[model samples]
Target: VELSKKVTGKLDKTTPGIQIWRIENMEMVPVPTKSYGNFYEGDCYVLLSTRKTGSGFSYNIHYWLGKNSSQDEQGAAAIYTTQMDEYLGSVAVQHREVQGHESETFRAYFKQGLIYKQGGVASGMK
Candidate 1:
C-alpha cells in the first residue's frame, strides 16, 4: 500500500494547506493548487495533506476514491500515499476514506456535495 520517494513539494507539511494528486502517466501528479477539490469518478485520489499543528508535522493522510474510479489507480494511490508518508517520516496516521461515506473534512473543503463527474480523468486520458 505504499512507495517511498523524495519529494520537493512544500505546501503545508507543517501548516494548513490541501493537496490532491491524480493518476496521470500511471503516477500521481498535482492538479492545480486551487483545483484540488474535485470528484473525478474514474481515477482514485491521494489527499496527502499534513494537518497543521503546533506539535508539527501531523500526518493526516486521507486516501480517497471515486465511485467509478479505476481500481488500478486506487492501488497506485495507496502506494503513493504510503511512500509519501514514509518520505515524510513514516509515522503517519493514514486511513482509507470510503467513497459513499466520506468524512466531513472531505466535504469540508468542498463547496457543494460530492459532485461525481463521469469519465473524469479517464475521459481526458482518451
Candidate 2:
C-alpha cells in the first residue's frame, strides 16, 4: 500500500489530508485447490488494506471445499476496520489469491442519513 499526505498552498485547521492507494503486485498469489471429478475450486484468500491515519494492518480468511461441489465450498468472511475511529471518511479493500492472485480493491466514503426529502412527508397526522 502507498500513502501520501495532501499539501495545499493554504493551511488551516484541516491542513492535513491523506491519500491511500493499494499496491498488490507482490501480494497476490494463487489460491491452491483440489479438483472434484472435473471441476476445480478455490480454498483460500488473502486481503490487505490501509488507513488514512498511516496506521497499517492486514486481515485474511480461509475456505473449505467438499466432494459434492454443491454445498461444499464454504468460506469465512473476516474484516477489520481501520484504526482511525473518528473523522473516518473513506476506506478501501482488496481480495487476492482467489483468481490467480488478481487483486481487486474498493473504497467507500462516509455519509449520514435523515428523512428530509424534497417533496415527501409521512402520510400520518401532520
Candidate 3:
C-alpha cells in the first residue's frame, strides 16, 4: 500500500525493528524461540535473532505470545503439547520506548513495505 505524504509524515519520527519475546512457562523462565524456526516451550525469546539473516533494511521478525486462535484460516495449530488459555507475554517494537535511531530501522519493515506472509498453522515447524 502506498503511504500518503500525510501518513508518511505522521510516521516520519517512527522507529523500525521487531522484538521477539518468548513467554515464560510454568517454571517462570521465559521461553526461547526463533522466528521461521522450530519453537518449543520453556525457551527464552531472543530479540532480533533473525535480524541479520535477511539482507534488507526492512527485514525483521515479530513475536506473538499468548493463546491466540490455534487455527488459522486453514485450520492448523502449534505442535507443542502445552497450551495456555491466554498470552504469557510478548515482545515487539516499542515505538515510544525504543532507543537510538537504529531501532527505527526495524519498524520500517512492518510500517512500510510488503508485509511478511503469515504461514498457515500447519507449518508449526517454522
How well does each candidate superpose onto the true structure, as a TM-score? 0.71, 0.20, 0.19
What tens digits encode model 3's per-residue C-alpha lDDT throughout 29-126? 22222342333322222233223323323222223322322323101111111111011112212221112232444344335432223323245575
lDDT to native, each model: 0.59, 0.22, 0.26
Give per-residue CA lDDT, model 2, range 1-126, as digits (tens).
111122111111222322221111211122212211111223222222222344533221222121212222222211111221111333333333333322222111112211111111122455
The clash numbers for all candidates, in the given order, read: 1, 0, 11
Order of all candidates by lDDT, from best down to worst? 1, 3, 2
Sort the candidates on TM-score, descending order. Answer: 1, 2, 3
**Cα lDDT for residue 30, model 2?**
25
lDDT of 1 by residue, 30-99 (tens): 6445566655655666776656655676765667765454677677777777766666666565767656
- The local distance difference test score of model 1 is 0.59
Candidate 3's displacement at residue 63, Å, is 2.7
Q: Output the lDDT of residue 102, model 1.
A: 57
Q: Pairing residues by index, what is the TM-score of model 2?
A: 0.20
Count: clashes, candidate 3: 11
Highest lDDT, which number? Answer: 1
